[PDB]
Symmetry: C3
Subunit: 149 residues, 3 copies
């Protein structure tokens, strides 16, 4: 019977949707995602900003963005080295915005940053001490993506 097979197929598809959802949960858990918190992942590869941005988006995430000290600390722990943050002032010099929209609020600028040094610096990296430095978007820094809570 055609309808019986179709009904079975529906059940099979729904069963797969739930198993996949579980696979995703377990992987996030195994990757250190904390309950009700965003999770950060890195392959430890250094690349220019646009490449990090393209990579994270492909994975359905975004370049990591610290919204407070806890998150900033978590990103630093994950990155282990200087990494790009999802913050830039490429649209209008001086006004840093999140790659996902909106003006930068919480910050952790290193002493004397941001300074748009020399020919210009429109991207931001969280350096080893967790402090921030605006740098050239063309420099290669560790790719770190964040995924929703």
């Amino acid at each position: 019977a055609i309808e019986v097979k179709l009904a079975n197929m529906e059940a099979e598809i729904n069963t797969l949707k739930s198993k996949l959802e579980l696979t995703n949960k377990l992987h996030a858990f195994s990757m250190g995602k904390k309950s009700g918190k965003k999770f950060f992942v890195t392959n430890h590869e250094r690349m220019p900003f646009s490449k990090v941005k393209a990579l994270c988006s492909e994975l359905r995430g975004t370049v990591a963005i610290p919204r407070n000290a806890e998150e900033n600390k978590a990103i630093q722990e994950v990155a282990k080295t200087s990494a790009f943050l999802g913050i830039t002032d490429e649209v209008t010099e001086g006004q840093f915005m999140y790659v996902t929209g909106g003006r930068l609020t919480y910050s952790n600028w290193k002493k004397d940053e941001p300074n748009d040094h020399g020919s210009g610096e429109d991207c931001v990296t969280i350096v080893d001490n967790g402090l921030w430095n605006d740098i050239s978007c063309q420099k290669k820094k560790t790719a770190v993506c964040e995924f929703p809570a």
Copy 2:
């Protein structure tokens, strides 16, 4: 056409089920699962026993349980900190049982443990050195889940 379409979709589904099964195997492997051994994993987050139980159960797992000295060590090195074990004596004081049912067989209690200190201590935690301590279930310890061998 409908009979063929349906037949070909069922085949697609079977391939996808196998592919998902592969993803699960590769993930466990990457997370250090040893052949014929249970898979222990943690996100490194500390919480009350009731939560770890709910969390592990949501991932189709249970709170880690050392059935012998080998598994007890395996759990210790995964947790890195004091983690809840799937054992409590909430039913009969002194009679510790696994959350999955059954009487406690292997144990690695610390000197003077269990002591059911203060108002009571019905949960168990494997402390840093692998030794056990009975502790209040309302306290917050590392969440470590186990998955079948």
Copy 3:
């Protein structure tokens, strides 16, 4: 209904196929896979060569094979301890071939290796320092699987 349901189910299947691809990409990413580079994974378990092969085949990969100094170091950094390479002279004594077929193109043999020492040595392990030594395929070494770029 029937054809509408069937059309929806094809859409459901394709959507699920994309989500799973996404899941695999994110896992490879978290597993340290760099762009355009093959990647290596290990559960850190020691086992005879035949088991490494079986395990990697089940994961749809192959035993790690270094094609150049770049990959040789990458394999060594993942294994951390001596691991089997997908290279053996089992078919014809003295003729080292890749498990995937073909004669060696790159080699980092430690001085005086390979020597088929004593009762015989047909497998190869990358020692902690990257050099190669032919050893017994019966010995238990770290399993490192290789996945395509």
